[PDB]
Amino acid sequence: HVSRNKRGQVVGTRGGFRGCTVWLTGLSGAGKTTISFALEEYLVSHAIPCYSLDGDNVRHGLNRNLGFSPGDREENIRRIAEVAKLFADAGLVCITSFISPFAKDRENARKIHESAGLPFFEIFVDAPLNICESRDVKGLYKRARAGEIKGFTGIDSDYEKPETPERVLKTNLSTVSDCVHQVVELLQEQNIVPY
Amino acid sequence: HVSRNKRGQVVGTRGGFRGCTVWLTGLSGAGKTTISFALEEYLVSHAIPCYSLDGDNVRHGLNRNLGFSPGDREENIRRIAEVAKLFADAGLVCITSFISPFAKDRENARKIHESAGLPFFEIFVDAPLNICESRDVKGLYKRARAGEIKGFTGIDSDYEKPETPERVLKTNLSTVSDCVHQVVELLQEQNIVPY
Numbered sequence: 472h473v474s475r476n477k478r479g480q481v482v483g484t485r486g487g488f489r490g491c492t493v494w495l496t497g498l499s500g501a502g503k504t505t506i507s508f509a510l511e512e513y514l515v516s517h518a519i520p521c522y523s524l525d526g527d528n529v530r531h532g533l534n535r536n537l538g539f540s541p542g543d544r545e546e547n548i549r550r551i552a553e554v555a556k557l558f559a560d561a562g563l564v565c566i567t568s569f570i571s572p573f574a575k576d577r578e579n580a581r582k583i584h585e586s587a588g589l590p591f592f593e594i595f596v597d598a599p600l601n602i603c604e605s606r607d608v609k610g611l612y613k614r615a616r617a618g619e620i621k622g623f624t625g626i627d628s629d630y631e632k633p634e635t636p637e638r639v640l641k642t643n644l645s646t647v648s649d650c651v652h653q654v655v656e657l658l659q660e661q662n663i664v665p666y
Numbered sequence: 667h668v669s670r671n672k673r674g675q676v677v678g679t680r681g682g683f684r685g686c687t688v689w690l691t692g693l694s695g696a697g698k699t700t701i702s703f704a705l706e707e708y709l710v711s712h713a714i715p716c717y718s719l720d721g722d723n724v725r726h727g728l729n730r731n732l733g734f735s736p737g738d739r740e741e742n743i744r745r746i747a748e749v750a751k752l753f754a755d756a757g758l759v760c761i762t763s764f765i766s767p768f769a770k771d772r773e774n775a776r777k778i779h780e781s782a783g784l785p786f787f788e789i790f791v792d793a794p795l796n797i798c799e800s801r802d803v804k805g806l807y808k809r810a811r812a813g814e815i816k817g818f819t820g821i822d823s824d825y826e827k828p829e830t831p832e833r834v835l836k837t838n839l840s841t842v843s844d845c846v847h848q849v850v851e852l853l854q855e856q857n858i859v860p861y
């Protein structure tokens with residue numbers, strides 16, 4: 472195939488190979504989707520080609536045959552990681568917004584990127600469970616409490632807090648714009664995004 | 667998310683939204699890999715960001731848990747189609763080089779692109795089986811004849827020749843450059859590649 476260095480010439484304007492994955496992780500309703508969109512607008516506004524993977528374009532498409540059992544969440548996250556690696560390798564900034572509950576799966580995603588020489592930035596989107604449940608963006612928390620959903624992350628299945636993420640976004644203690652700026656700063660420090 | 671039309675400005679220096687999938691189909695050794703590489707080179711050399719999906723980057727990753735039974739080749743091609751659609755939606759020209767033996771799965775790939783308003787070009791890379799077997803690029807035909815591979819398309823499983831492909835490339839009757847030109851011409855007529 473054509474090399475990353477050639478792809479760096481034609482992907483976008485700025486030149487340079489800037490493929491990587493921004494990997495958002497955290498509780499349902501903690502803010503992954505919001506941050507991923509606002510990051511995406513920042514990136515396009517600054518002429519860095521990017522793409523957002525989330526449940527909307529993954530879960531009822533590539534992964535529509537997956538549910539929420541531990542084996543299925545692990546396949547979900549495995550397939551996502553492989554596809555993300557393909558977008559990073561194509562030279563885009565790939566932003567993922569899956570709860571991705573289990574440390575093991577996140578570290579496997581990272582390993583698949585590192586083996587391929589692609590930067591992987593794990594971003595802990597950290598809000599308290601009670602705050603996520605009070606946001607109840609989609610009404611899942613109220614259904615899970617009522618027993619209509621089981622295996623629901625945060626209530627009757629575990630979220631394993633990232634021990635060593637590249638950034639922690641405290642979404643109950645700061646604005647969307649501050650959270651984005653924290654990630655952008657990281658991409659600046661890694662020459663992915665111009666100052 | 668950010669709109670297709672905004673993302674189209676930012677993916678490359680040629681303006682305009684050029685996301686689409688060039689879907690190559692045909693027998694092992696018919697010439698999919700060769701055409702896809704030369705097409706990728708044409709696009710990158712003309713400053714159009716593109717990406718190639720093939721067995722090398724899909725089958726031992728995303729689709730590493732899939733084999734060659736008819737159901738597995740059908741799941742293989744479905745997942746492939748969904749990811750291709752994701753690259754088209756990001757604004758890249760996505761080139762796939764899977765044998766993809768079954769018409770039903772190919773037409774499902776098309777439908778998944780068309781439903782999303784993304785161009786899908788099915789490209790029949792057509793050489794006679796005997797010619798493919800004489801090329802035996804990777805030694806698959808000699809292994810299949812010896813019974814070490816089963817279900818090997820063309821020998822003990824069917825290839826269903828495309829009835830309405832957008833182009834037919836007779837790779838035994840013309841050069842790589844003529845065949846590529848047939849595809850490039852199609853992309854010009856489809857406003858994917860400027861005149």
Ligand SMILES: Nc1ncnc2c1ncn2[C@@H]1O[C@H](COP(=O)(O)OP(=O)(O)O)[C@@H](O)[C@H]1O
Nearest residue numbers: 498499500501502503504505608642645646647
């Ligand atoms: N700093 C912040 N980051 C992300 N979301 C925030 C923040 N502050 C408030 N919110 C609100 O919390 C909700 C986050 O939900 P969502 O982004 O759908 O979460 P997730 O994708 O992790 O399920 C949104 O309604 C958003 O407006």
Ligand SMILES: Nc1ncnc2c1ncn2[C@@H]1O[C@H](COP(=O)(O)OP(=O)(O)O)[C@@H](O)[C@H]1O
Nearest residue numbers: 694695696697698699700803837840841842845
């Ligand atoms: N017009 C043509 N188009 C494509 N390949 C050709 C052509 N003429 C000769 N070939 C040769 O045919 C072989 C096809 O191998 P490959 O492209 O790997 O097939 P596939 O990807 O379909 O398995 C290559 O060695 C290539 O050089």
Ligand SMILES: Nc1ncnc2c1ncn2[C@@H]1O[C@H](COP(=O)(O)OS(=O)(=O)O)[C@@H](O)C1O
Nearest residue numbers: 721734739742764765766767815816817818819
């Ligand atoms: N039994 C088989 N039939 C066809 N291809 C096989 C078989 N076993 C292994 N392969 C291989 O299939 C790879 C391509 O398969 P695709 O993944 O292109 O097949 S498809 O039928 O699911 O679209 C070849 O590179 C290759 O060697």
Ligand SMILES: Nc1ncnc2c1ncn2[C@@H]1O[C@H](COP(=O)(O)OS(=O)(=O)O)[C@@H](O)[C@H]1O
Nearest residue numbers: 499539544547569570571572611621622623624
């Ligand atoms: N049982 C559940 N556990 C966690 N999330 C669920 C569950 N059921 C539905 N969902 C949800 O489905 C989406 C979460 O999907 P993912 O982010 O893909 O989860 S993950 O664990 O496999 O990484 C959210 O809409 C969401 O709250």
